[PDB]
Amino acid sequence: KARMRWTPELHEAFVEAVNSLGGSERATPKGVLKIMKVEGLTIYHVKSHLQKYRTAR
Amino acid sequence: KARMRWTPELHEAFVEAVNSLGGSERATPKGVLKIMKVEGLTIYHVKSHLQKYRTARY
DNA sequence: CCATATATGAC
DNA sequence: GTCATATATGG
């Protein structure tokens, strides 16, 4: 149990990464992670966050 | 650890329960569970499923 | 409890 | 990679 918290800064960085990869449907967890370059950030962190981002109305 | 499986029939039942209470925005986990009356079905099962249903685009 | 964020398991 | 479900958080 060491849960992660999507601070506005992190989220902002995530967004930029996703735009840079051509939006939420095109981007991939691995690709985003690669771009974000954040120490301790796992692919599973990004995989989950992206799923949610993608279904946000 | 006993992960559950939302068969189409179960889902169908879930939907009916939710409509019965006035669609996704009005319905509540406890309320749905009460209506569904399914052996082994916990409130946490329904809570999760409802969250997803509520954010389903279509 | 009701709602939401995040994690973990399953295709 | 995608998607389904569970578990943790906040009110």
What residue ranges define each of the domains in chain B, with the CATH number in brackets?
1-58 (1.10.10.60)
What is the SS3 assignment for A13?
helix
- Report yes or no: B43 and B31 within 8 Å, Cβ to Cβ: no
What is the SS3 assignment for A20?
helix
The region, left, alpha or beta by phi > 0 then psi within -120 to 50, assigned to residue B5 is beta
DSSP state letter for A47: H
- Resolution for this experimental structure (Å): 2.8
Which residues on chain A are in Cβ contact (under 8 Å) with B55?
A: 55-57
- Cβ neighbour number for residue A40 with a 10 Å cutoff: 7
Please count the residues of chain B.
58
Helix (H) or strand (E) holding B25: helix B23-26
- Report yes or no: A29 and A47 within 8 Å, Cβ to Cβ: yes
Q: How far is A39 from chain B (nearest CA, A)?
A: 31
- Report yes or no: A21 and A32 within 8 Å, Cβ to Cβ: yes
- Report yes or no: B26 and B35 within 8 Å, Cβ to Cβ: no
Dihedral in degrees, nearest 10, Cα atoms A44, A48, A26, A13: -80
Mention every residue, 6+ apart, whose C-beta is less than 8 A from residue A36.
Answer: A13, A14, A17, A46
Q: From the alpha carbon of B1, which nucleotide's C1' atom is closest? A: D6
Q: How far is B39 from chain A (nearest CA, A)?
A: 31
Instruction: Show the tokens assigned to B22.
Output: 């006035």
Q: How far apart are CA A13 and CA A22, in angstroms?
A: 14
Instruction: Show the tokens assigned to B43.
Output: 């409130």
Instruction: Show the tokens assigned to A17.
Output: 């990464």
- Cβ neighbour number for residue B57 with a 10 Å cutoff: 7
Instruction: Show the tokens assigned to B23.
Output: 């669609």
Strand C contact set, beta carbon < 7 A:
A 1, 3-6, 44-45, 47-49, 51-52; B 3, 28-31, 43, 47-48, 50-51, 54
